[model samples]
Target: AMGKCPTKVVLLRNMVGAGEVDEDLEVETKEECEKYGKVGKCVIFEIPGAPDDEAVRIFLEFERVESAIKAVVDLNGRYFGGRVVKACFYNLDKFRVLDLAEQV
Candidate 1:
């Protein structure tokens, strides 16, 4: 049997604003990317002031080198909507893809 620990697990959420869009457009088109698929391009206007270097490093360690580099370049673009941005990479030999959840 397991016993409860004195410390509690605390979870946090990331605060991000949706990409700027026309308020009048009622329907928005979105695309879904498969998990661990090829990298896609997108613009990330505002990265959190306190960057998560650990998360980025972990992703690079596991993902394909070329694809990972391209992803980072795409993030620098100022546009949105096209492909899903992968925050981590996968390795079959290692057993699982490193997918780190965002925390505020």
Candidate 2:
């Protein structure tokens, strides 16, 4: 059977403005985020060579898909760093298959 989209994930936008979000602030992030459900992992990444307007993306993986569904509704369009926050899910299957997927 075709499995459910296992990407059980959410991508938060503009989480740190132009700079990288450190582990200390990231702890707070996880704390608040867990209000919806369990987070398996949370990560931050940048768009390499992005133009000056770029913002860091907060990648989050949840233990349950229901939790992810709730997060998109709860935080999308909210503001942080004077910019609106966006939330969405990705294809976890693809994420797992990517050999060059580097983490920072």
Candidate 3:
């Protein structure tokens, strides 16, 4: 028997408390992803400095290496330098790696 192919994960756009929006919700990209059909997760971080392209790239790279997942980052609305980061993984048989968020 053959295994099933992974389905694209859906990500919702939302704000993080105490964090301001920087680039607004990335609806276009989200829609694009949905159109292209890919699975992933999204998160907004509260970094101290102004958000720049380089900053987003570095942050995503760090998350990818540390978490062993590939991620795409986007800037949220124009309020709190809000940034949205997403990580996509293949064959996530178990959700053990997600324990980090639960502990927080």
Instruction: Report clash pairs, candidate 3.
Output: 9-39, 20-80, 21-79, 21-80, 22-77, 22-82, 23-76, 23-77, 24-76, 24-77
Q: Who is ahead in TM-score, 1 or 3?
A: 3
RMSD of every candidate to native, in Å, equals 13.7, 5.0, 11.5
Between candidates 1 and 2, the one scoring higher on lDDT is 2
Report the CA-based lDDT of candidate 3 relative to the real structure: 0.29
Per-residue alpha-carbon lDDT of model 3 for 1-104, expressed as tens digits? Answer: 01122222222223333343346544444434433334245444433443343122111112222222222222222232354432332233223243211101
Candidate 1 regions off by >4 Å? 1-63, 81-99, 102-104
TM-score, each model? 0.24, 0.75, 0.27
What digit string (tens of lDDT, one per residue) describes model 1 on residues 3-98? 111111111111123333344211221121212234232222223344433222112221244544333344333233442332322332222232
Task: Output the lDDT of residue 39, model 1.
Answer: 28
Residue pairs with backbone atoms closer than 3 Å in model 1 (clashes): none
Query: How far out, in Å, is residue 22 in model 2?
Result: 3.5
What lDDT does the true structure give each of the candidates? Answer: 0.27, 0.66, 0.29
All candidates in order of TM-score, best leading: 2, 3, 1
Off by over 4 Å in 2: 1-7, 52-54, 97-104
